[PDB]
Amino acid sequence: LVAGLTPIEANGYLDFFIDRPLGMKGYILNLTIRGQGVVKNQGREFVCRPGDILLFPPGEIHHYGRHPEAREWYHQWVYFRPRAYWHEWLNWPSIFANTGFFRPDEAHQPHFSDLFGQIINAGQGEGRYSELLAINLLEQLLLRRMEAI
Amino acid sequence: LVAGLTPIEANGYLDFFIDRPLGMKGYILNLTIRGQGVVKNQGREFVCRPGDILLFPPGEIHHYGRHPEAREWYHQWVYFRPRAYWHEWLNWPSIFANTGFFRPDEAHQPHFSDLFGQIINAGQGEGRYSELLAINLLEQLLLRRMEAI
């Protein structure tokens, strides 16, 4: 767990498109908080809105940025190599290829972007056991997803 | 994780002393919430106060009840067989024999009896994956203990 938040601003610093066509060895959950995002894949084009958590399993093409009509795309991301049991709570409904999708119900959403947010901090924390809490919260989050669906 | 809360009331229903002189195969964290408790062991006698979380490792003699001058001793308890890594966050300062001891600082206490409480509910919940959240929260709790000391 190394996690963080990326503030894409139109015409700003990191306003480039991340483009990892052959993926990574680790899972990446992506949660839009501000602006719209545009996850692209083989000619297709989804479009995230805030409150959306997308799953990018090992090997998935990573290609997304700010959707051309959006003024930005702030989003927290968490990169991780999953715990043993975790595997089961990682079969998520795709949109195209095996890029997972979530989008809580009005009531569940705040706590999810809130529980997700808690992960980022933990993981980016100058602390002793803080790497584990991130892992632990990353755990709690997924569990939460189940009890939801 | 099977957990619960036990409301000892003077002269009431369960106002008897639990007496397992040869312990159990599982760990038991004990958190006083109301009244005073009296953990006894080989002629000795500690005395818990609310906010106290005590550890009872496998094999520990379990013998405690309502301290004779207290009107009750409400306390949540959580019985569990620890996860692999967990082992490390379970060396706790004793009082007598290897009965662990905690007692947060004013600020940490509420969230701990609050995070502990969350475990009880989860575990006693009529739910799908709720047994795991209890386990997950039991995890978070211990981690919390570390970042504290």
GROMACS .gro file of C-alpha atoms in nm:
model
  298
    1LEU     CA    1   0.000   0.000   0.000
    2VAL     CA    2   0.124   0.315  -0.149
    3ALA     CA    3  -0.173   0.528  -0.225
    4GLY     CA    4  -0.244   0.888  -0.304
    5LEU     CA    5  -0.474   1.142  -0.463
    6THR     CA    6  -0.425   1.289  -0.810
    7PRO     CA    7  -0.570   1.639  -0.888
    8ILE     CA    8  -0.604   1.673  -1.260
    9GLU     CA    9  -0.669   2.036  -1.356
   10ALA     CA   10  -0.742   2.140  -1.707
   11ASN     CA   11  -0.428   2.267  -1.868
   12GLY     CA   12  -0.246   2.230  -1.532
   13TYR     CA   13   0.042   2.024  -1.388
   14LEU     CA   14  -0.062   1.660  -1.404
   15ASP     CA   15  -0.336   1.697  -1.668
   16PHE     CA   16  -0.181   1.426  -1.882
   17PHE     CA   17  -0.338   1.084  -1.952
   18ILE     CA   18  -0.192   0.792  -1.763
   19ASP     CA   19  -0.118   0.525  -2.027
   20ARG     CA   20  -0.007   0.179  -1.904
   21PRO     CA   21  -0.133  -0.045  -2.189
   22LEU     CA   22   0.012  -0.361  -2.034
   23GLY     CA   23  -0.092  -0.295  -1.677
   24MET     CA   24   0.092  -0.349  -1.352
   25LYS     CA   25   0.147  -0.638  -1.112
   26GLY     CA   26  -0.084  -0.473  -0.862
   27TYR     CA   27  -0.448  -0.385  -0.816
   28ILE     CA   28  -0.556  -0.024  -0.839
   29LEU     CA   29  -0.892   0.103  -0.704
   30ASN     CA   30  -0.984   0.440  -0.844
   31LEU     CA   31  -1.235   0.683  -0.685
   32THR     CA   32  -1.337   1.002  -0.856
   33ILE     CA   33  -1.402   1.286  -0.615
   34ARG     CA   34  -1.416   1.595  -0.837
   35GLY     CA   35  -1.472   1.657  -1.204
   36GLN     CA   36  -1.544   1.380  -1.452
   37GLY     CA   37  -1.298   1.115  -1.562
   38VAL     CA   38  -1.278   0.925  -1.889
   39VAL     CA   39  -1.163   0.560  -1.866
   40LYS     CA   40  -1.084   0.448  -2.231
   41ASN     CA   41  -1.021   0.091  -2.368
   42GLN     CA   42  -1.006  -0.049  -2.723
   43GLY     CA   43  -1.191   0.230  -2.897
   44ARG     CA   44  -1.447   0.241  -2.616
   45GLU     CA   45  -1.493   0.522  -2.365
   46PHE     CA   46  -1.663   0.506  -2.024
   47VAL     CA   47  -1.693   0.830  -1.817
   48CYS     CA   48  -1.669   0.835  -1.441
   49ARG     CA   49  -1.855   1.071  -1.208
   50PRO     CA   50  -1.774   1.138  -0.847
   51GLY     CA   51  -1.842   0.853  -0.609
   52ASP     CA   52  -1.726   0.595  -0.861
   53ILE     CA   53  -1.476   0.331  -0.752
   54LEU     CA   54  -1.324   0.138  -1.044
   55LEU     CA   55  -1.109  -0.178  -1.017
   56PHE     CA   56  -0.803  -0.228  -1.228
   57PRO     CA   57  -0.682  -0.587  -1.177
   58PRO     CA   58  -0.325  -0.709  -1.258
   59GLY     CA   59  -0.268  -0.695  -1.633
   60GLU     CA   60  -0.550  -0.451  -1.706
   61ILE     CA   61  -0.468  -0.174  -1.950
   62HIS     CA   62  -0.466   0.151  -1.755
   63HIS     CA   63  -0.568   0.448  -1.974
   64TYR     CA   64  -0.776   0.738  -1.838
   65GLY     CA   65  -0.760   1.111  -1.776
   66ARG     CA   66  -0.982   1.420  -1.773
   67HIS     CA   67  -1.287   1.389  -2.002
   68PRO     CA   68  -1.248   1.682  -2.254
   69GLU     CA   69  -1.551   1.873  -2.129
   70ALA     CA   70  -1.461   1.844  -1.757
   71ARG     CA   71  -1.251   2.118  -1.592
   72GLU     CA   72  -1.054   1.863  -1.381
   73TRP     CA   73  -1.060   1.502  -1.247
   74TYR     CA   74  -0.950   1.472  -0.883
   75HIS     CA   75  -0.925   1.115  -0.778
   76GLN     CA   76  -0.769   0.904  -0.507
   77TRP     CA   77  -0.602   0.587  -0.615
   78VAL     CA   78  -0.474   0.293  -0.419
   79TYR     CA   79  -0.222   0.048  -0.560
   80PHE     CA   80  -0.192  -0.286  -0.386
   81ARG     CA   81  -0.100  -0.656  -0.400
   82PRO     CA   82  -0.407  -0.827  -0.233
   83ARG     CA   83  -0.422  -1.042   0.074
   84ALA     CA   84  -0.496  -1.413   0.035
   85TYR     CA   85  -0.871  -1.421   0.118
   86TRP     CA   86  -0.926  -1.079  -0.037
   87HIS     CA   87  -0.941  -1.253  -0.377
   88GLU     CA   88  -1.307  -1.337  -0.329
   89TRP     CA   89  -1.418  -0.974  -0.272
   90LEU     CA   90  -1.245  -0.864  -0.593
   91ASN     CA   91  -1.482  -1.007  -0.864
   92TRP     CA   92  -1.642  -0.680  -0.964
   93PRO     CA   93  -1.888  -0.595  -1.241
   94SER     CA   94  -1.688  -0.462  -1.541
   95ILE     CA   95  -1.779  -0.199  -1.802
   96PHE     CA   96  -1.540  -0.328  -2.072
   97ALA     CA   97  -1.269  -0.594  -2.041
   98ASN     CA   98  -1.216  -0.667  -1.664
   99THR     CA   99  -1.213  -0.312  -1.528
  100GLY     CA  100  -1.433  -0.336  -1.220
  101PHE     CA  101  -1.715  -0.104  -1.130
  102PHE     CA  102  -1.889   0.022  -0.816
  103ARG     CA  103  -2.112   0.325  -0.752
  104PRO     CA  104  -2.284   0.319  -0.413
  105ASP     CA  105  -2.646   0.408  -0.338
  106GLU     CA  106  -2.697   0.768  -0.211
  107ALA     CA  107  -2.662   0.658   0.156
  108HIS     CA  108  -2.358   0.434   0.119
  109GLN     CA  109  -2.155   0.670  -0.097
  110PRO     CA  110  -2.028   0.930   0.166
  111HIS     CA  111  -1.897   0.660   0.400
  112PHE     CA  112  -1.731   0.485   0.105
  113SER     CA  113  -1.546   0.794  -0.027
  114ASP     CA  114  -1.487   0.856   0.345
  115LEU     CA  115  -1.363   0.506   0.420
  116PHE     CA  116  -1.162   0.514   0.095
  117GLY     CA  117  -1.019   0.852   0.189
  118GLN     CA  118  -0.912   0.708   0.523
  119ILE     CA  119  -0.701   0.456   0.332
  120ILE     CA  120  -0.510   0.720   0.130
  121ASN     CA  121  -0.413   0.915   0.449
  122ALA     CA  122  -0.313   0.601   0.644
  123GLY     CA  123  -0.098   0.488   0.356
  124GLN     CA  124   0.060   0.824   0.296
  125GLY     CA  125   0.127   0.860   0.670
  126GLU     CA  126   0.463   0.927   0.837
  127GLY     CA  127   0.403   0.651   1.086
  128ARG     CA  128   0.497   0.319   1.243
  129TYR     CA  129   0.217   0.079   1.175
  130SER     CA  130   0.025   0.315   0.943
  131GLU     CA  131   0.103   0.100   0.632
  132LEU     CA  132  -0.102  -0.181   0.786
  133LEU     CA  133  -0.399   0.037   0.878
  134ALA     CA  134  -0.412   0.133   0.513
  135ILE     CA  135  -0.409  -0.233   0.430
  136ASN     CA  136  -0.666  -0.292   0.710
  137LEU     CA  137  -0.890  -0.015   0.588
  138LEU     CA  138  -0.846  -0.131   0.228
  139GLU     CA  139  -0.979  -0.458   0.375
  140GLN     CA  140  -1.273  -0.300   0.556
  141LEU     CA  141  -1.365  -0.112   0.236
  142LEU     CA  142  -1.402  -0.424   0.023
  143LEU     CA  143  -1.595  -0.602   0.298
  144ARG     CA  144  -1.824  -0.297   0.294
  145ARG     CA  145  -1.879  -0.341  -0.074
  146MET     CA  146  -2.010  -0.696  -0.018
  147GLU     CA  147  -2.253  -0.607   0.266
  148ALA     CA  148  -2.378  -0.349   0.015
  149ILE     CA  149  -2.456  -0.562  -0.292
  150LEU     CA  150  -1.542  -1.417   1.650
  151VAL     CA  151  -1.831  -1.463   1.877
  152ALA     CA  152  -1.846  -1.164   2.100
  153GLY     CA  153  -2.095  -1.001   2.330
  154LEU     CA  154  -2.158  -0.776   2.627
  155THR     CA  155  -2.221  -0.899   2.980
  156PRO     CA  156  -2.426  -0.678   3.222
  157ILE     CA  157  -2.347  -0.784   3.574
  158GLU     CA  158  -2.597  -0.632   3.818
  159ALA     CA  159  -2.565  -0.670   4.189
  160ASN     CA  160  -2.785  -0.950   4.304
  161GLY     CA  161  -2.924  -0.984   3.949
  162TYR     CA  162  -2.926  -1.245   3.670
  163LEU     CA  163  -2.565  -1.300   3.566
  164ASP     CA  164  -2.399  -1.161   3.881
  165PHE     CA  165  -2.195  -1.477   3.926
  166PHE     CA  166  -1.816  -1.500   3.890
  167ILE     CA  167  -1.687  -1.657   3.572
  168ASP     CA  168  -1.435  -1.923   3.683
  169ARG     CA  169  -1.228  -2.097   3.411
  170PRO     CA  170  -0.911  -2.188   3.605
  171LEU     CA  171  -0.754  -2.366   3.307
  172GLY     CA  172  -0.844  -2.112   3.043
  173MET     CA  173  -0.967  -2.159   2.689
  174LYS     CA  174  -0.809  -2.218   2.348
  175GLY     CA  175  -0.896  -1.863   2.248
  176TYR     CA  176  -0.804  -1.508   2.330
  177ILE     CA  177  -1.048  -1.291   2.519
  178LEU     CA  178  -1.024  -0.908   2.531
  179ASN     CA  179  -1.229  -0.761   2.810
  180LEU     CA  180  -1.349  -0.396   2.825
  181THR     CA  181  -1.525  -0.259   3.128
  182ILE     CA  182  -1.790  -0.004   3.042
  183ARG     CA  183  -1.989   0.035   3.365
  184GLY     CA  184  -1.925  -0.039   3.728
  185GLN     CA  185  -1.597  -0.180   3.855
  186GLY     CA  186  -1.469  -0.529   3.789
  187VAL     CA  187  -1.240  -0.746   3.999
  188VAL     CA  188  -0.995  -0.969   3.806
  189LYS     CA  189  -0.852  -1.221   4.066
  190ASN     CA  190  -0.549  -1.462   4.032
  191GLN     CA  191  -0.353  -1.667   4.288
  192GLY     CA  192  -0.455  -1.476   4.596
  193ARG     CA  193  -0.408  -1.146   4.414
  194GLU     CA  194  -0.682  -0.903   4.313
  195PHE     CA  195  -0.668  -0.632   4.046
  196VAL     CA  196  -0.975  -0.404   3.998
  197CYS     CA  197  -1.082  -0.274   3.661
  198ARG     CA  198  -1.246   0.062   3.592
  199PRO     CA  199  -1.429   0.162   3.279
  200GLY     CA  200  -1.214   0.207   2.972
  201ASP     CA  201  -0.992  -0.086   3.066
  202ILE     CA  202  -0.919  -0.351   2.804
  203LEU     CA  203  -0.761  -0.667   2.949
  204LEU     CA  204  -0.607  -0.955   2.749
  205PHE     CA  205  -0.662  -1.314   2.843
  206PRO     CA  206  -0.433  -1.529   2.626
  207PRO     CA  207  -0.484  -1.906   2.564
  208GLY     CA  208  -0.434  -2.096   2.888
  209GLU     CA  209  -0.484  -1.798   3.117
  210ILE     CA  210  -0.697  -1.859   3.423
  211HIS     CA  211  -1.018  -1.663   3.378
  212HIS     CA  212  -1.164  -1.553   3.715
  213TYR     CA  213  -1.340  -1.216   3.759
  214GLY     CA  214  -1.675  -1.066   3.847
  215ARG     CA  215  -1.828  -0.763   4.020
  216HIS     CA  216  -1.598  -0.609   4.284
  217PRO     CA  217  -1.802  -0.632   4.614
  218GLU     CA  218  -1.845  -0.257   4.652
  219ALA     CA  219  -1.954  -0.197   4.289
  220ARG     CA  220  -2.327  -0.205   4.200
  221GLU     CA  221  -2.259  -0.382   3.865
  222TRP     CA  222  -1.985  -0.459   3.605
  223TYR     CA  223  -2.102  -0.419   3.244
  224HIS     CA  224  -1.840  -0.532   3.003
  225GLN     CA  225  -1.804  -0.635   2.643
  226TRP     CA  226  -1.592  -0.936   2.573
  227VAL     CA  227  -1.456  -1.076   2.252
  228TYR     CA  228  -1.339  -1.434   2.219
  229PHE     CA  229  -1.115  -1.515   1.926
  230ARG     CA  230  -0.846  -1.736   1.770
  231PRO     CA  231  -0.593  -1.476   1.628
  232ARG     CA  232  -0.479  -1.423   1.275
  233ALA     CA  233  -0.122  -1.515   1.181
  234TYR     CA  234   0.047  -1.170   1.195
  235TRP     CA  235  -0.176  -1.057   1.480
  236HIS     CA  236   0.059  -1.244   1.717
  237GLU     CA  237   0.296  -0.949   1.729
  238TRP     CA  238   0.032  -0.698   1.849
  239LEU     CA  239  -0.067  -0.929   2.135
  240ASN     CA  240   0.234  -0.890   2.376
  241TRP     CA  241   0.061  -0.674   2.633
  242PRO     CA  242   0.176  -0.545   2.971
  243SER     CA  243   0.040  -0.782   3.241
  244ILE     CA  244  -0.074  -0.711   3.599
  245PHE     CA  245  -0.017  -1.066   3.729
  246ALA     CA  246   0.068  -1.380   3.531
  247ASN     CA  247   0.012  -1.303   3.156
  248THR     CA  248  -0.320  -1.119   3.175
  249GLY     CA  249  -0.267  -0.822   2.946
  250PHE     CA  250  -0.347  -0.463   3.025
  251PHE     CA  251  -0.443  -0.146   2.839
  252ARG     CA  252  -0.604   0.180   2.955
  253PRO     CA  253  -0.597   0.456   2.694
  254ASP     CA  254  -0.514   0.823   2.750
  255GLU     CA  255  -0.822   1.050   2.792
  256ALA     CA  256  -0.836   1.124   2.415
  257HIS     CA  257  -0.787   0.771   2.286
  258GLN     CA  258  -1.032   0.604   2.521
  259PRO     CA  259  -1.374   0.698   2.361
  260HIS     CA  260  -1.269   0.580   2.015
  261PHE     CA  261  -1.131   0.258   2.167
  262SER     CA  262  -1.449   0.167   2.361
  263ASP     CA  263  -1.619   0.287   2.042
  264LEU     CA  264  -1.405   0.082   1.807
  265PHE     CA  265  -1.430  -0.213   2.050
  266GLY     CA  266  -1.806  -0.169   2.066
  267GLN     CA  267  -1.818  -0.181   1.687
  268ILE     CA  268  -1.663  -0.527   1.705
  269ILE     CA  269  -1.930  -0.669   1.943
  270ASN     CA  270  -2.218  -0.552   1.713
  271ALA     CA  271  -2.049  -0.676   1.392
  272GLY     CA  272  -1.990  -1.013   1.551
  273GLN     CA  273  -2.334  -1.043   1.699
  274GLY     CA  274  -2.487  -0.938   1.366
  275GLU     CA  275  -2.748  -1.129   1.163
  276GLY     CA  276  -2.547  -1.083   0.847
  277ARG     CA  277  -2.352  -1.225   0.554
  278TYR     CA  278  -1.997  -1.105   0.588
  279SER     CA  279  -2.046  -0.948   0.933
  280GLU     CA  280  -1.829  -1.217   1.105
  281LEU     CA  281  -1.530  -1.088   0.907
  282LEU     CA  282  -1.591  -0.721   0.983
  283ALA     CA  283  -1.577  -0.819   1.348
  284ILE     CA  284  -1.251  -0.991   1.276
  285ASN     CA  285  -1.143  -0.686   1.066
  286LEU     CA  286  -1.238  -0.443   1.338
  287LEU     CA  287  -1.075  -0.666   1.601
  288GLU     CA  288  -0.771  -0.618   1.373
  289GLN     CA  289  -0.804  -0.241   1.347
  290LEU     CA  290  -0.840  -0.220   1.727
  291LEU     CA  291  -0.509  -0.390   1.801
  292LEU     CA  292  -0.332  -0.185   1.533
  293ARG     CA  293  -0.475   0.119   1.712
  294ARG     CA  294  -0.323   0.003   2.035
  295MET     CA  295   0.026   0.003   1.877
  296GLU     CA  296   0.001   0.353   1.719
  297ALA     CA  297  -0.095   0.455   2.074
  298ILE     CA  298   0.197   0.320   2.280
   0.00000   0.00000   0.00000
